[PDB]
Amino acid sequence: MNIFEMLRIDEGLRLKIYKDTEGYYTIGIGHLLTKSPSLNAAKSELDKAIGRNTNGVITKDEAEKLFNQDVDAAVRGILRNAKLKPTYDSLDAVRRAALINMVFQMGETGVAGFTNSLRMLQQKRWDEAAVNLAKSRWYNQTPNRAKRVITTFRTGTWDAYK
Numbered sequence: 001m002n003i004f005e006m007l008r009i010d011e012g013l014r015l016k017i018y019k020d021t022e023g024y025y026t027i028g029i030g031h032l033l034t035k036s037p038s039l040n041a042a043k044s045e046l047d048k049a050i051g052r053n054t055n056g057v058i059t060k061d062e063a064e065k066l067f068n069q070d071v072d073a074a075v076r077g078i079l080r081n082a083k084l085k086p087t088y089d090s091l092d093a094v095r096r097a098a099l100i101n102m103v104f105q106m107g108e109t110g111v112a113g114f115t116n117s118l119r120m121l122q123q124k125r126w127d128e129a130a131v132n133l134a135k136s137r138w139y140n141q142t143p144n145r146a147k148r149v150i151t152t153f154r155t156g157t158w159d160a161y162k
């Protein structure tokens with residue numbers, strides 16, 4: 001198991017424009033297109049992202065390419081962020097994948113807002129961090145995916161994904 005397989009399980013794969021759990025226009029492996037309610041603004045972003053006239057449909061390779069970019073952007077955003085970087089550097093490899101997962105889903109800003117939980121992860125107080133992470137909108141809205149991520153932080157193994 002690795003970050004790519006983990007995120008592919010959590011996000012799934014759709015080759016046609018769809019709406020996410022928040023109701024936003026998305027495509028591929030969790031690639032957010034726009035928060036705008038316009039399906040046209042969505043198609044326009046999509047064509048911009050792919051570099052061709054897509055009419056809302058992409059191929060598997062195209063989905064995979066967006067996915068490579070998104071993962072790369074996520075890690076990098078973590079490494080340039082004063083609140084995230086110290087937590088990331090402190091963790092083992094499996095738990096690093098859990099943090100990349102949260103950032104891919106909610107963005108750097110959202111994650112940087114879990115101040116108390118990050119402080120608990122740095123200290124390696126696993127059980128305590130798991131309880132604090134669950135007191136969030138994130139956990140209440142996407143509880144099955146949140147439990148998987150939280151279990152990963154708690155255990156430092158890929159058990160929740162096997």
Ligand SMILES: [Cl-]
Nearest residue numbers: 048049066069
């Ligand atoms: Cl893009």
